[PDB]
Structure 1
Amino acid sequence: GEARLEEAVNRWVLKFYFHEALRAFRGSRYGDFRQIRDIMQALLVRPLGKEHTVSRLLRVMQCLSRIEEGENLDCSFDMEAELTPLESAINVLEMIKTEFTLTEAVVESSRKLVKEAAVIICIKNKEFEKASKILKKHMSKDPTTQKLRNDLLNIIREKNLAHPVIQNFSYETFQQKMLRFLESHLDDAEPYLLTMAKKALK
């Protein structure tokens, strides 16, 4: 029973920090976001109670974590593969779509965004083969993106980082949209903890 008390608190702490992480992300305060993320990670090895209540929370956190790290290509969230953070972000996106019961129509516009930045970023980075790889595996597919497949494709062989697509690409702009997207499938709140701090910072 001493155990089920810890469980209850750990749940409050996770929810509270998840709340502050979005806040930090929202304010483009990415260092704080990262310190809070690590706290939540250290929190996951502990008894959380029942996983119906933080799994949506947890998935969005995963997506954001991978996105906030997308510019570091040597960083990996995949255990088995050499995946760029944005490739791993796509996979999370997929779990979110499956677990949040959303439709392809609702999700394709964001994931599309993710595919784009994953390639551009490889490109903005002189990593031209990965760029090709990601494009041929994720974008070398749909309809309304051919024009883009073909432009990103040529930008690659010519190494045209001088291209309007590349130069006007803004990751900060990218990040914020992804957060806006992920937020619209999550409640809003005040975590018991934050609510009790005010009830006392009284």
Structure 2
Amino acid sequence: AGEARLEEAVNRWVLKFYFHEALRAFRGSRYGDFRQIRDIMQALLVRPLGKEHTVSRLLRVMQCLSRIEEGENLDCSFDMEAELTPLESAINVLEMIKTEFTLTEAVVESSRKLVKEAAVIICIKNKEFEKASKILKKHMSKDPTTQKLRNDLLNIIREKNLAHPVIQNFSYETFQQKMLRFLESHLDDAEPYLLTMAKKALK
């Protein structure tokens, strides 16, 4: 079972390569390609990887981006025992990122606020007003940075006013790319080893 250390090394190379290409697809708004690469990484995760700090950090970011990418699909669940919307799950992953990456509350508060805003607004646009109130109460009633935002969303929910500028001016594309720029700023930017060896093979 020295072949086990061989597969572990290759699986790490493969995981890091497809993570690099998944970030590239997300950056280019090629979310279909991101989905397909995400599914490759999911299947690979059942295999032995040894372990790094790099793998744990990239899998957390991959976890967060995948929930954000599915955030407008309220039929999707990332915990079948829970009843969380995808963007609610993204909030929970962000908190795990804050703890495991040892980030301050000041560094994560703005981007976390963006997820809270999107989580409530998506429920509003699906006319899931009861879920929107539950997310609003849980995640904004205490957050000091979302007090004005909470004030606007409370009236939108009560009036069921999907035509409010807060709802209509919201851009999920802008939200997604802001989240990627934040998450990428906390990761190593090196090119994966498989990519470098591919460039030399095609020379």
1:92-149 CA-partner distances (Å, limit 9, x unpaired)? 0011000101000000101110000000011111110100000000001122422221
Task: Tell me the number of residue pairs that the alignment of Structure 1 and Structure 2 aligns.
Answer: 202
- Alpha-carbon contact 2:113-2:145 (below 8 Å) kept: no
Structure 2 Cα separation of the partners of residues 79 and 139 of structure 1 = 25
Q: Report deviation, 1:51.
A: 4.0
Distance 1:144 1:12, change over 3 A: closer
Q: Report deviation, 1:61.
A: 0.1
Task: Name the structure 1 match of 2:187.
Answer: 186
RMSD (CA atoms): 0.9
Structure 2 Cα separation of the partners of residues 58 and 15 of structure 1 = 10
Structure 1 Cα separation of the partners of residues 202 and 82 of structure 2 = 47
Q: Report deviation, 1:187.
A: 1.4
**Normalization by structure 1: what TM-score?**
0.98
1:47-99 CA-partner distances (Å, limit 9, x unpaired)? 10124330000000000000000000010002420110000000000110001
Runs of 4+ residues deviating >4 angstroms: none
Structure 1 Cα separation of the partners of residues 147 and 191 of structure 2 = 44
Structure 1 Cα separation of the partners of residues 185 and 51 of structure 2 = 24
| Structure 2 gaps, min length 5 | none
Q: Report deviation, 1:200.
A: 1.0
Structure 1 Cα separation of the partners of residues 67 and 74 of structure 2 = 11
Range with greater deviation from structure 2 (9-18 or 124-133): 124-133
| Structure 1 gaps, min length 5 | none
- Alpha-carbon contact 2:19-2:58 (below 8 Å) kept: yes
Q: Report deviation, 1:199.
A: 0.8
Structure 2 Cα separation of the partners of residues 80 and 184 of structure 1 = 32
Structure 1 Cα separation of the partners of residues 145 and 201 of structure 2 = 54
Q: Report deviation, 1:3.
A: 1.2
Structure 2 Cα separation of the partners of residues 90 and 199 of structure 1 = 41
Q: Report deviation, 1:151.
A: 1.0
Structure 2 Cα separation of the partners of residues 118 and 143 of structure 1 = 17
Structure 2 Cα separation of the partners of residues 50 and 156 of structure 1 = 46
Range with greater deviation from structure 2 (140-149 or 25-34): 140-149
